[PDB]
Amino acid sequence: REVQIHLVREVQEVYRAQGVSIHDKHIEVIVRQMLRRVTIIDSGSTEFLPGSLIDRAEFEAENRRVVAEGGEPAAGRPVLMGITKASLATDSWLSAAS
């Protein structure tokens, strides 16, 4: 939350200086998309390659399944991604093919 708030304020400062007013709602909509993924430090009982970006909700579901099975959770840390990398890793193949 702290880094998200910092990003919103920092973007807003440029437009405030220049003289264009943009409500922070719009900036927050994008910034939510920026911080929607985690990174894996160690695999363990999970089948996740180290250094692989992963969806947050899917990671939590996988951990919920692996602890129920009896496997230790993977080392998952939230990570910020640039817009380019964030957009490159979509889900549907028909969209990603373009």
Coordinates of C-alpha atoms in Angstrom, one line a residue, residues 32-98:
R32 CA -3.6 -1.8 -9.3
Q33 CA -2.7 -3.6 -12.5
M34 CA 1.0 -3.0 -11.9
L35 CA 1.1 -4.9 -8.6
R36 CA -1.0 -7.9 -9.5
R37 CA 1.8 -10.5 -9.5
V38 CA 4.4 -12.2 -7.3
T39 CA 7.8 -13.8 -7.9
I40 CA 9.1 -17.2 -6.7
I41 CA 12.4 -17.4 -4.8
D42 CA 12.3 -21.1 -4.0
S43 CA 10.2 -23.9 -5.5
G44 CA 10.0 -26.6 -2.8
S45 CA 7.0 -28.9 -2.9
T46 CA 5.5 -26.4 -5.5
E47 CA 6.3 -27.1 -9.1
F48 CA 7.1 -23.4 -9.9
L49 CA 10.4 -22.6 -11.6
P50 CA 12.5 -20.1 -9.6
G51 CA 12.5 -16.6 -11.1
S52 CA 9.0 -17.0 -12.6
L53 CA 6.3 -14.4 -12.3
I54 CA 3.0 -15.8 -11.0
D55 CA -0.6 -14.6 -10.5
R56 CA -1.4 -13.7 -6.9
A57 CA -4.7 -15.6 -6.6
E58 CA -3.4 -18.6 -8.4
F59 CA -0.4 -18.7 -6.1
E60 CA -2.6 -18.6 -3.1
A61 CA -4.8 -21.4 -4.5
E62 CA -1.7 -23.5 -5.2
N63 CA -0.4 -23.0 -1.7
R64 CA -3.8 -23.9 -0.3
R65 CA -3.7 -27.1 -2.3
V66 CA 0.0 -27.9 -1.4
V67 CA -0.4 -27.5 2.3
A68 CA -3.5 -29.7 2.2
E69 CA -1.5 -32.3 0.3
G70 CA 1.4 -31.9 2.8
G71 CA 3.9 -29.7 0.9
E72 CA 5.7 -26.6 2.2
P73 CA 4.6 -23.4 0.5
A74 CA 6.8 -21.8 -2.1
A75 CA 8.9 -18.6 -1.4
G76 CA 6.5 -16.1 -2.9
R77 CA 7.2 -12.4 -2.7
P78 CA 5.1 -9.6 -4.2
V79 CA 7.0 -7.8 -6.9
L80 CA 6.4 -4.6 -8.9
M81 CA 6.4 -4.9 -12.7
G82 CA 6.6 -2.3 -15.4
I83 CA 3.6 -1.9 -17.7
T84 CA 5.4 -3.6 -20.6
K85 CA 6.2 -6.8 -18.7
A86 CA 2.8 -6.7 -17.0
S87 CA 1.0 -6.6 -20.4
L88 CA 3.2 -9.1 -22.1
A89 CA 2.1 -11.9 -19.7
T90 CA -1.6 -12.1 -20.4
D91 CA -3.7 -15.2 -20.3
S92 CA -5.6 -15.7 -23.5
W93 CA -3.4 -16.9 -26.4
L94 CA -5.5 -15.1 -29.0
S95 CA -4.8 -11.8 -27.5
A96 CA -1.1 -12.6 -26.7
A97 CA -0.6 -13.6 -30.4
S98 CA -0.7 -9.9 -31.4

